[PDB]
PDB file of all heavy atoms in Angstrom:
ATOM      1  N   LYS D 100     -33.463  38.516  -4.556  1.00 44.11           N
ATOM      2  CA  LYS D 100     -33.465  37.368  -3.659  1.00 44.11           C
ATOM      3  C   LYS D 100     -33.049  37.778  -2.252  1.00 44.11           C
ATOM      4  O   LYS D 100     -33.553  37.234  -1.262  1.00 44.11           O
ATOM      5  CB  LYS D 100     -32.540  36.283  -4.211  1.00 44.11           C
ATOM      6  CG  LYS D 100     -32.365  35.070  -3.318  1.00 44.11           C
ATOM      7  CD  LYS D 100     -32.291  33.802  -4.154  1.00 44.11           C
ATOM      8  CE  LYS D 100     -30.852  33.358  -4.363  1.00 44.11           C
ATOM      9  NZ  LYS D 100     -30.769  32.042  -5.052  1.00 44.11           N
ATOM     10  N   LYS D 101     -32.133  38.745  -2.143  1.00 43.93           N
ATOM     11  CA  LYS D 101     -31.708  39.221  -0.831  1.00 43.93           C
ATOM     12  C   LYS D 101     -32.785  40.074  -0.171  1.00 43.93           C
ATOM     13  O   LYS D 101     -32.972  40.013   1.049  1.00 43.93           O
ATOM     14  CB  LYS D 101     -30.401  40.005  -0.948  1.00 43.93           C
ATOM     15  CG  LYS D 101     -29.169  39.130  -1.114  1.00 43.93           C
ATOM     16  CD  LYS D 101     -27.889  39.950  -1.061  1.00 43.93           C
ATOM     17  CE  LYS D 101     -27.702  40.762  -2.327  1.00 43.93           C
ATOM     18  NZ  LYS D 101     -27.815  39.908  -3.538  1.00 43.93           N
ATOM     19  N   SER D 102     -33.492  40.888  -0.958  1.00 41.73           N
ATOM     20  CA  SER D 102     -34.566  41.700  -0.393  1.00 41.73           C
ATOM     21  C   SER D 102     -35.694  40.824   0.139  1.00 41.73           C
ATOM     22  O   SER D 102     -36.277  41.120   1.187  1.00 41.73           O
ATOM     23  CB  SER D 102     -35.092  42.684  -1.436  1.00 41.73           C
ATOM     24  N   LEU D 103     -36.018  39.743  -0.575  1.00 39.76           N
ATOM     25  CA  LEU D 103     -36.986  38.783  -0.055  1.00 39.76           C
ATOM     26  C   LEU D 103     -36.478  38.127   1.221  1.00 39.76           C
ATOM     27  O   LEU D 103     -37.253  37.867   2.147  1.00 39.76           O
ATOM     28  CB  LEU D 103     -37.299  37.720  -1.109  1.00 39.76           C
ATOM     29  CG  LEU D 103     -37.930  38.171  -2.426  1.00 39.76           C
ATOM     30  CD1 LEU D 103     -38.654  37.011  -3.090  1.00 39.76           C
ATOM     31  CD2 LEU D 103     -38.879  39.337  -2.202  1.00 39.76           C
ATOM     32  N   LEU D 104     -35.173  37.851   1.287  1.00 39.33           N
ATOM     33  CA  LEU D 104     -34.611  37.164   2.444  1.00 39.33           C
ATOM     34  C   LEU D 104     -34.711  38.004   3.712  1.00 39.33           C
ATOM     35  O   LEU D 104     -34.606  37.454   4.814  1.00 39.33           O
ATOM     36  CB  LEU D 104     -33.159  36.771   2.152  1.00 39.33           C
ATOM     37  CG  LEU D 104     -32.535  35.601   2.919  1.00 39.33           C
ATOM     38  CD1 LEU D 104     -31.475  34.929   2.059  1.00 39.33           C
ATOM     39  CD2 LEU D 104     -31.922  36.036   4.235  1.00 39.33           C
ATOM     40  N   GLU D 105     -34.921  39.319   3.588  1.00 39.71           N
ATOM     41  CA  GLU D 105     -35.153  40.139   4.774  1.00 39.71           C
ATOM     42  C   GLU D 105     -36.430  39.722   5.490  1.00 39.71           C
ATOM     43  O   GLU D 105     -36.486  39.720   6.725  1.00 39.71           O
ATOM     44  CB  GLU D 105     -35.215  41.619   4.399  1.00 39.71           C
ATOM     45  N   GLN D 106     -37.469  39.370   4.730  1.00 41.18           N
ATOM     46  CA  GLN D 106     -38.665  38.803   5.342  1.00 41.18           C
ATOM     47  C   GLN D 106     -38.355  37.459   5.986  1.00 41.18           C
ATOM     48  O   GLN D 106     -38.883  37.139   7.057  1.00 41.18           O
ATOM     49  CB  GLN D 106     -39.774  38.665   4.299  1.00 41.18           C
ATOM     50  N   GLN D 107     -37.499  36.660   5.345  1.00 41.51           N
ATOM     51  CA  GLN D 107     -36.995  35.453   5.989  1.00 41.51           C
ATOM     52  C   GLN D 107     -36.098  35.792   7.173  1.00 41.51           C
ATOM     53  O   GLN D 107     -36.149  35.105   8.198  1.00 41.51           O
ATOM     54  CB  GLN D 107     -36.249  34.590   4.972  1.00 41.51           C
ATOM     55  CG  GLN D 107     -37.138  33.601   4.229  1.00 41.51           C
ATOM     56  CD  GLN D 107     -37.660  34.145   2.910  1.00 41.51           C
ATOM     57  OE1 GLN D 107     -37.073  35.052   2.323  1.00 41.51           O
ATOM     58  NE2 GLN D 107     -38.768  33.585   2.438  1.00 41.51           N
ATOM     59  N   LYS D 108     -35.280  36.842   7.055  1.00 41.91           N
ATOM     60  CA  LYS D 108     -34.560  37.348   8.220  1.00 41.91           C
ATOM     61  C   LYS D 108     -35.532  37.800   9.301  1.00 41.91           C
ATOM     62  O   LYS D 108     -35.291  37.587  10.495  1.00 41.91           O
ATOM     63  CB  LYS D 108     -33.638  38.497   7.817  1.00 41.91           C
ATOM     64  CG  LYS D 108     -32.384  38.055   7.090  1.00 41.91           C
ATOM     65  CD  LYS D 108     -31.905  39.106   6.102  1.00 41.91           C
ATOM     66  CE  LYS D 108     -31.307  40.306   6.809  1.00 41.91           C
ATOM     67  NZ  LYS D 108     -30.714  41.270   5.840  1.00 41.91           N
ATOM     68  N   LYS D 109     -36.636  38.431   8.897  1.00 41.54           N
ATOM     69  CA  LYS D 109     -37.685  38.784   9.845  1.00 41.54           C
ATOM     70  C   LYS D 109     -38.447  37.552  10.314  1.00 41.54           C
ATOM     71  O   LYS D 109     -38.938  37.521  11.449  1.00 41.54           O
ATOM     72  CB  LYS D 109     -38.639  39.798   9.212  1.00 41.54           C
ATOM     73  N   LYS D 110     -38.566  36.534   9.457  1.00 41.23           N
ATOM     74  CA  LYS D 110     -39.190  35.283   9.875  1.00 41.23           C
ATOM     75  C   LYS D 110     -38.345  34.580  10.929  1.00 41.23           C
ATOM     76  O   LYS D 110     -38.850  34.193  11.989  1.00 41.23           O
ATOM     77  CB  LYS D 110     -39.413  34.374   8.666  1.00 41.23           C
ATOM     78  CG  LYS D 110     -40.158  33.089   8.990  1.00 41.23           C
ATOM     79  CD  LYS D 110     -39.893  32.007   7.953  1.00 41.23           C
ATOM     80  CE  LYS D 110     -39.760  30.638   8.604  1.00 41.23           C
ATOM     81  NZ  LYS D 110     -40.153  29.536   7.680  1.00 41.23           N
ATOM     82  N   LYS D 111     -37.049  34.406  10.655  1.00 41.86           N
ATOM     83  CA  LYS D 111     -36.155  33.843  11.661  1.00 41.86           C
ATOM     84  C   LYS D 111     -35.980  34.794  12.838  1.00 41.86           C
ATOM     85  O   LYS D 111     -35.735  34.352  13.967  1.00 41.86           O
ATOM     86  CB  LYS D 111     -34.801  33.503  11.037  1.00 41.86           C
ATOM     87  CG  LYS D 111     -34.705  32.085  10.494  1.00 41.86           C
ATOM     88  CD  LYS D 111     -35.473  31.911   9.196  1.00 41.86           C
ATOM     89  CE  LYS D 111     -34.646  32.357   8.003  1.00 41.86           C
ATOM     90  NZ  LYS D 111     -35.306  32.020   6.712  1.00 41.86           N
ATOM     91  N   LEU D 112     -36.132  36.087  12.582  1.00 38.87           N
ATOM     92  CA  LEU D 112     -35.990  37.075  13.643  1.00 38.87           C
ATOM     93  C   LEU D 112     -36.772  38.337  13.319  1.00 38.87           C
ATOM     94  O   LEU D 112     -37.882  38.532  13.810  1.00 38.87           O
ATOM     95  CB  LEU D 112     -34.518  37.418  13.858  1.00 38.87           C
TER      96      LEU D 112
END
Side-chain angles (χ1 to χ4, degrees), chain D residues 100-101 103-104 107-108 110-111:
Chain D
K100 176 142 99 174
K101 283 187 287 308
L103 298 202
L104 204 151
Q107 271 93 23
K108 285 150 72 174
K110 184 202 141 152
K111 269 74 84 172

